[PDB]
Specification:
homodimer; about 500 residues; alpha+beta; five-stranded antiparallel sheet; 20 strands; about 30% helix; binds chloride ion; transmembrane helix (chain A); membrane (chain A); Penicillin-binding protein 1 (chain A)
Amino acid sequence: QQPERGKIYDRNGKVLAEDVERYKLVAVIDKKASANSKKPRHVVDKKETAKKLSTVINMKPEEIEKRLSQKKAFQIEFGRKGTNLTYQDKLKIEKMNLPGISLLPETERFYPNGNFASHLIGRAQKNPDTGELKGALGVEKIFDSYLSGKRGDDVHLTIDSNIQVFVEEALDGMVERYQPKDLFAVVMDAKTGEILAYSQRPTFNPETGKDFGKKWANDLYQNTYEPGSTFKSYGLAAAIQEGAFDPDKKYKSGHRDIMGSRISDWNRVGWGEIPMSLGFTYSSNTLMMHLQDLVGADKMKSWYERFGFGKSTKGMFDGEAPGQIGWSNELQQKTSSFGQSTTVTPVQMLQAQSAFFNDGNMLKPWFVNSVENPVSKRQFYKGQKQIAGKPITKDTAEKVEKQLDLVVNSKKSHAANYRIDGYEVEGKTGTAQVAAPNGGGYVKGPNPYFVSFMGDAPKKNPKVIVYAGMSLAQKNDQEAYELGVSKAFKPIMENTLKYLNVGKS
Amino acid sequence: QQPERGKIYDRNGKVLAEDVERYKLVAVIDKKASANSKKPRHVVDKKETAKKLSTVINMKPEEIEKRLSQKKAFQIEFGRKGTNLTYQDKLKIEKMNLPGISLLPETERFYPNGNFASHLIGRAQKNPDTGELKGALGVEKIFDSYLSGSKKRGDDVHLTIDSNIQVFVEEALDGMVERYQPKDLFAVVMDAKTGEILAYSQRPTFNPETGKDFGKKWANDLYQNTYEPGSTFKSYGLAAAIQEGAFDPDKKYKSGHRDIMGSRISDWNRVGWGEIPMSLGFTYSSNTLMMHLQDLVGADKMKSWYERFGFGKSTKGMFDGEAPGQIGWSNELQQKTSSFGQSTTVTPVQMLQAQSAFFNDGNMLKPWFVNSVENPVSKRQFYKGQKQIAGKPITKDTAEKVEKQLDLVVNSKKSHAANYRIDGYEVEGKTGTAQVAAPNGGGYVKGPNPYFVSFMGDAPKKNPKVIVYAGMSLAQKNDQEAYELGVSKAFKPIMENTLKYLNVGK
Ligand SMILES: [Cl-]
Ligand SMILES: [Cl-]
C-alpha cells in the first residue's frame, strides 16, 4: 500500500491528475485449485472462457486461449489489456461466474482529460512490483518529491481548463491542415504573467502513454527557436528609447550588403524612401538593420540582455534553456535584429513582450499557483506576479504598442488575417528560416519556415497575450507562409476573450 | 549542430554508449524538382517505390504508398521506421536508384551491446527539432549535465562494470526468465574487497538502443526497488548475537515454534528439530533461533544493531532516488519477523554493503559503480570513484565467527543449500525464501509458492574475490522448483564463470 500520490489541479480546482482504483484480470488455470472444491476454482473450458472475456477486454479469443494454455503456470494475466479495467468491467466479468476468473484491485494514475496540456502536466509511471508511481516528465517529475506521499501534496497550476480546451482544439486543427514538424501555443494573463493555457504538437497522452518519449522537450521552456520578426519588437523598443526611431522620419528601404550576404526586405526590392512607422508595419529588415546602426552594436547587445534574452527566466520547469544572443560578427548582429542567429525560448518571448503592457516592467511568467497538503493545509509554495526587470519606460512601451496596433490595423497592413471580427487585436508576425539540426545551414524547401504571431487583446489594454508558433509545415506549406498561425490565433483568442467576458462589437 | 554527447565506458574502456551518424529516409514527391531535368527527381512510380523501400524499412508497401500519396506535400518522411537507418541500409537504398529518394545524415545515441546493463546505463532520448539528447534513466540521466556538451565536447563517464562479467549475468538472467518467468529478477556481482560493482542486471528490463519496453518499469532494482529480503537478513542478527555474547555455537536452544502476539511463527519445516545446538540452527535457517537471539539481545539493542548495519537509510550512492527501506519495529510481531527478513524492507545495495563487513575485518564497504567523470579533450577529471568505508558495525573476531556459519550453511553435512555448491570452488553464503507483500491491499501475495527467493554468496570462502547477490520474486512458471532451488541456476554460472575470468585457482 503506497501513500496516495497528490493531485494536480487547474486554477479552478478541476482535477488534471489523481490516483484511482482500477482492476486487473487474473485467471487460475492449475487443476490443483479445484482439488478440495465443490465447484471448479480454475478455468475448465478455455474456449468458452476466452469467448466471454473477449467481449469485455480488448483481446481476440485465440490470444486469450494461447495465454490460458501456459504450461507449469498456476495463474496467468493478460498484459495491459487485462489491467486498468473499470469497476463496470469488473461487474460485467463477475456476473459471468467464470471458474478461476477474478479481478484484483490496483492503483493507477489517471488523467481525466487524456491528451491535454500533456507536455506541461507530464506523466507518472508505475513500478509493478510495489505500485510506486514516479514522475517522468513535467509537473509530475518536477514536483515528484511533494506529490509522492500519509498523503502526497497537491500541486495547483495557473492553467484554466476552459482555455486549455480552446488551445487543444486549435492545435489539432493546425496538425490536420499543415502537418508541421513542431507547433505550440500559449495563453498568458497580460497583467500577471500567469500561464492560462499551453500545448504543443507533436505530444503524448499521459493517460495511456501513447507517444511518450518521442519528444522529451517542452516547447515553452526547453526547446529553442530562431524567433523571426516577432523579435523586431525589442529592437523597436530599444530604438524608441534611444531616440533613433521617429515614426514619421523617412529611411531607405530595399536591401543591405553585409559580409558577403544580401539581406533584403521580404519583397526583395523594398519600397524606396518610406516612413519608419510604415517600415515596421511592413516588417522591414532594412529598417531594423538601420536602427541597429543608429543605436550601435554594443548597446544593442545590452538591450537584448536587458530584455532577458540569453538567460533562463528561472521558472520552475526543469532544464530551462537559456538560448543565446548571436552577436559574434556583424552578420549575426544584423540578422539578430530580425530574429535569426539569436535563439530564444517561448517563455523568454512572453516575458519580454509583457513589458509593453505593464509600464515597461517584464513579468516573470509562472504556471504553478500552489503546492499544498490537503490534510495538514500546509502551503509549501505560493506563486505570485513578479517583475523580471524594467528595460523600458512607460512612454517607450506606449510607443511600441502604437506600432503593434498598426501592424494589424493599418490600412497598409500585411497582417489583416489576424483580425477577429468584433474585437480589437494587435501584435507582430514572424516568418523565420529554421536551422537544420545536423548543421550546415537552414532547412531547404519551398517554404521552410517557422511562422508565428505574438498577439494581445483587447488592444492597448489587453487581458491576454497569445503566442503561437508553427515550424516547418509538411502540408500546405504555401498557405502556412501566407497565413502564418492565423488559423490558430483567431479561434484561441476569440474563444478566450468570450470566456473571460470581454465585450464584442 | 549539437556538441557530441560524452561516452559511457566499462572499466576496461569498452564503449557502452556513444553518439554515431545514422540516416533518415526522405522522399521528394513534388513535380517541381523534375521541371528542368532529363531524369525524374521526384517519385514517379509510388507503388514500386513502396514495394522496394519495404525491403529496408520495416513498413508494409500499402502504408508507404499511402504516405507517398499525401496531397499538398513537397517531401515525405516515414516516422521512426524511416530514421536511425544504418550506413548499410543507406547503400542498399541508394543502389536501387529510386527517383526522389535520398538519405539525410543524422546523429543518434548508440548502445553497442543492445540490451545490456540497461537499467544501470539508462537511455538518452533525442529531441528531433534540434537533435539534443537528454538522459531519461540511469547513468544517462544522473550524469546528463556532464555527458551533454552544452552544460565543446561532452564529458565521458567510466563505470566499474566489466563487460565480460556482465555477459555472464545477462545470460544467467535470460535462463531464469525462460525457466521461471518471474515478476522480478536481479543479480549483482561486487568486488568483495573494494565494493566496486562489476556487473548488474535485472528482468524485466528494456533495450536502450531501440527503446523497446522502456517505461514499463522505471525502478532500478539495486537502488530504487525494495524487498522484504528473507533469511539472507539472518546474517546481521547472527553478527549482532555473536558480538553481544548471545550466540554460542555449542549451546543448545529449543526449536519448533513461537506464538508471538497471537500469530504462530515456526521454522520452515513446521515441526522443527526439538532441542538442538545454535550453530546447527543457523545451518537450518531456523526462525526460532533468531527470535530467541532477539530476546537474549533485547529489542532496543537489535533495532540499533540493524541501524549500524546501514538498514533504514540510503547508502548515499550516485544513483538517483535511492530508497532508504525501513526497519519494521512497531510491535513485537514486526520485530520478530524482522529477525528473519520480513516486515523490514531493504534495497539490494544495502544488503551488499552490510554483507561486505564479514570479509573486510568488520568494515562495510560503500558500493560504487562510477569510476570517473572526465573530459577527453581537456583531460579534466571531475570525479574519481574509490573504496570507502561505510561503517564498522562489528569487530574482526565477530566477522570471522559469522563467516564460519556462512561456510556451514552451504558446506555442512546437514546442509539444505547444497545446490549452491560449485565443483572445484569453495563457496559460502546464505539463502532466503521470503513471502512478498501484495502491491495493493494488505497481506502477502497468495499462491502455491509465492516467494522471493535469493542467495547472498561469496567465493573463494573466507578470502572471497567477489560477492554475488541474486534474487527472484514470484516465479509464474516452475514455482515449485523456484522454491526448492532458489536462485542456484543463476548463482552457479555467474560465480563459476566470474571466478575463472578473474583467474581464481580451481
Ligand atoms: Cl511557475
Ligand atoms: Cl558510484
